[PDB]
Amino acid sequence: VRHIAIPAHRGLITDRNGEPLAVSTPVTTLWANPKELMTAKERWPQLAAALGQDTKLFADRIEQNAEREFIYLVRGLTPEQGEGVIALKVPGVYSIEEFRRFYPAGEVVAHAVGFTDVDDRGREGIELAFDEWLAGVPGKRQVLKDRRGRVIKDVQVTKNAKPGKTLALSIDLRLQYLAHRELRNALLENGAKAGSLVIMDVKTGEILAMTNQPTYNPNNRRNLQPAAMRNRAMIDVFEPGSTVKPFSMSAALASGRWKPSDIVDVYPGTLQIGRYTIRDVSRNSRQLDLTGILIKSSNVGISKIAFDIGAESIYSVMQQVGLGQDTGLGFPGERVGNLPNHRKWPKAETATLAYGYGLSVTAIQLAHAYAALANDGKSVPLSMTRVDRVPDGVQVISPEVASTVQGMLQQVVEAQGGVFRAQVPGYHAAGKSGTARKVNAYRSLFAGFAPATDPRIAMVVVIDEPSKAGYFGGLVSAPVFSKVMAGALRLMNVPPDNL
Ligand SMILES: *C(=O)[C@H](CN1CC(C(=O)NCCN2C(=O)c3cc(O)c(O)cc3C2=O)=C(C(=O)O)N1)NC(=O)/C(=N\OC(C)(C)C(=O)O)c1csc(N)n1
Numbered sequence: 001v002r003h004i005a006i007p008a009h010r011g012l013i014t015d016r017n018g019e020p021l022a023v024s025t026p027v028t029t030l031w032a033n034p035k036e037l038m039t040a041k042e043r044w045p046q047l048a049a050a051l052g053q054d055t056k057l058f059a060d061r062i063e064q065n066a067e068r069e070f071i072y073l074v075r076g077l078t079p080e081q082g083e084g085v086i087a088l089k090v091p092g093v094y095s096i097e098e099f100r101r102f103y104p105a106g107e108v109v110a111h112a113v114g115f116t117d118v119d120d121r122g123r124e125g126i127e128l129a130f131d132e133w134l135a136g137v138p139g140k141r142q143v144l145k146d147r148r149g150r151v152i153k154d155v156q157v158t159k160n161a162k163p164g165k166t167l168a169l170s171i172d173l174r175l176q177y178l179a180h181r182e183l184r185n186a187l188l189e190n191g192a193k194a195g196s197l198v199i200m201d202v203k204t205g206e207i208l209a210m211t212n213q214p215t216y217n218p219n220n221r222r223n224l225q226p227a228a229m230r231n232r233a234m235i236d237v238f239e240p241g242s243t244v245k246p247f248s249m250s251a252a253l254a255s256g257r258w259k260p261s262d263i264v265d266v267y268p269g270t271l272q273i274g275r276y277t278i279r280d281v282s283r284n285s286r287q288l289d290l291t292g293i294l295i296k297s298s299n300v301g302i303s304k305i306a307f308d309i310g311a312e313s314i315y316s317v318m319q320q321v322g323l324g325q326d327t328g329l330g331f332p333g334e335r336v337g338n339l340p341n342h343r344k345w346p347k348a349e350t351a352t353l354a355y356g357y358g359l360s361v362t363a364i365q366l367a368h369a370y371a372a373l374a375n376d377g378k379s380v381p382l383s384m385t386r387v388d389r390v391p392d393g394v395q396v397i398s399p400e401v402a403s404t405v406q407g408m409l410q411q412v413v414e415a416q417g418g419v420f421r422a423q424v425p426g427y428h429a430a431g432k433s434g435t436a437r438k439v440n441a442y443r444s445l446f447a448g449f450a451p452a453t454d455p456r457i458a459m460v461v462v463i464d465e466p467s468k469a470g471y472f473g474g475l476v477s478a479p480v481f482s483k484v485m486a487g488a489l490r491l492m493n494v495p496p497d498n499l
Pocket residue numbers: 239240241242243281282296297299355356357358433434435436437438472473474
């Protein structure tokens with residue numbers, strides 16, 4: 001008499017609308033008692049054939065395990081294939097009924113959902129993070145064996161298996177599909193190495209979509225590079241560059257010393273700070289109002305504002321909206337990044353902070369920060385699960401500064417010489433481009449939200465090493481935001497505010 005495991009049914013993972021993302025399917029494991037097999041050698045070759053094993057390698061194996069009462073023959077056949085080889089009636093060949101994950105959306109949601117191992121344990125993504133909730137508790141059954149390992153009776157069930165619990169993700173499979181296709185299309189269109197796209201509900205903290213390129217089929221994980229398994233939206237850190245300028249502007253408008261119509265002189269489009277040189281791409285400007293600084297992405301303009309208000313006020317807004325701060329999702333391998341702090345801020349670091357140099361963030365943090373700005377300065381906690389009861393937000397930017405900065409980002413998108421590729425047919429949209437030279441090689445960024453009049457959705461597009469002549473965020477990333485924001489607002493029945 002021994003006690004042996006009854007595997008629990010692993011909980012269904014669904015999208016927010018109940019569409020299956022991870023399903024436990026019944027499969028059959030074959031095992032053999034070698035001590036029984038050793039009395040039916042004439043049966044081995046037929047049994048070897050049936051397992052697609054070679055006659056002599058199979059016989060070498062049984063011989064080598066002749067002292068044992070258990071070995072695995074094969075794991076995870078269908079119930080039909082399993083029943084096919086049990087029907088050969090080979091002494092000492094036995095059937096365990098098991099569960100195996102199937103992922104109906106495959107590579108589309110692989111980074112978020114993750115996978116289980118052959119033992120049905122969660123090892124990546126949601127499968128790992130919610131493993132206790134999904135696995136349930138195994139059962140035990142009492143099994144009498146004769147003295148040479150022959151299973152005879154099933155004496156009783158000692159303890160019943162408790163099933164796993166259903167888990168509904170925040171992901172909307174319809175937005176996930178749209179996000180997946182358009183990031184793939186832009187990646188191919190730009191000969192890009194990698195990229196990420198994140199969509200947030202600005203009101204609920206919910207991640208409606210999270211896709212990366214490259215991806216992999218979790219149903220077929222054989223001969224698979226690590227690179228394609230990385231959930232880059234959460235585990236990759238990058239410099240966000242000029243996409244942080246709206247947080248600098250937030251500190252400027254909250255200081256009491258700046259309003260949108262104020263002028264900064266950026267001539268000649270450079271500014272020497274000790275040994276270091278601050279440089280604009282476009283160097284044909286003198287006076288720029290604060291909206292112009294964002295439209296022309298003048299590093300010199302935001303630097304002079306940063307000198308006047310102090311890095312401390314800028315650091316604080318960036319810390320508050322979650323840049324380089326723990327998200328608290330508890331997701332495997334999640335990076336925090338780095339928001340550098342100083343006891344006393346020097347000049348050079350005051351400027352670089354203000355335009356997103358020497359800062360490290362995730363696509364998720366950047367999306368969360370834009371979510372807070374869109375939701376009138378209120379940060380709602382992030383969830384990867386369906387939110388039925390929305391937790392209270394924290395007011396991180398005053399509602400009036402948030403509303404002024406939204407208006408300015410609406411201008412970045414809609415005004416003359418603005419980022420017109422980010423415009424969303426039938427809607428007012430708002431956002432900020434960025435371009436990071438990595439240490440030539442570029443990262444193209446667009447972060448924004450829509451509709452501008454009552455924000456619903458925040459979105460970040462990161463394309464890593466576009467290899468065509470176009471590398472600027474406004475060229476590469478902005479058109480992706482456009483197509484994916486259009487489809488997302490329509491799938492979510494958001495009334496057009498620009499008709
Ligand atoms: C923030 O991301 C800063 C500043 N960049 C500048 C900029 C940009 O210049 N985009 C617009 C470029 N540009 C046009 O597309 C365009 C089109 C027309 O029709 C006209 O007439 C003019 C122009 C025009 O000037 C960025 C943006 O995408 O918004 N932001 N980035 C940096 O400071 C760093 N990278 O600088 C560059 C990319 C110039 C470089 O090659 O080094 C940076 C920040 S963090 C990091 N690692 N690098």
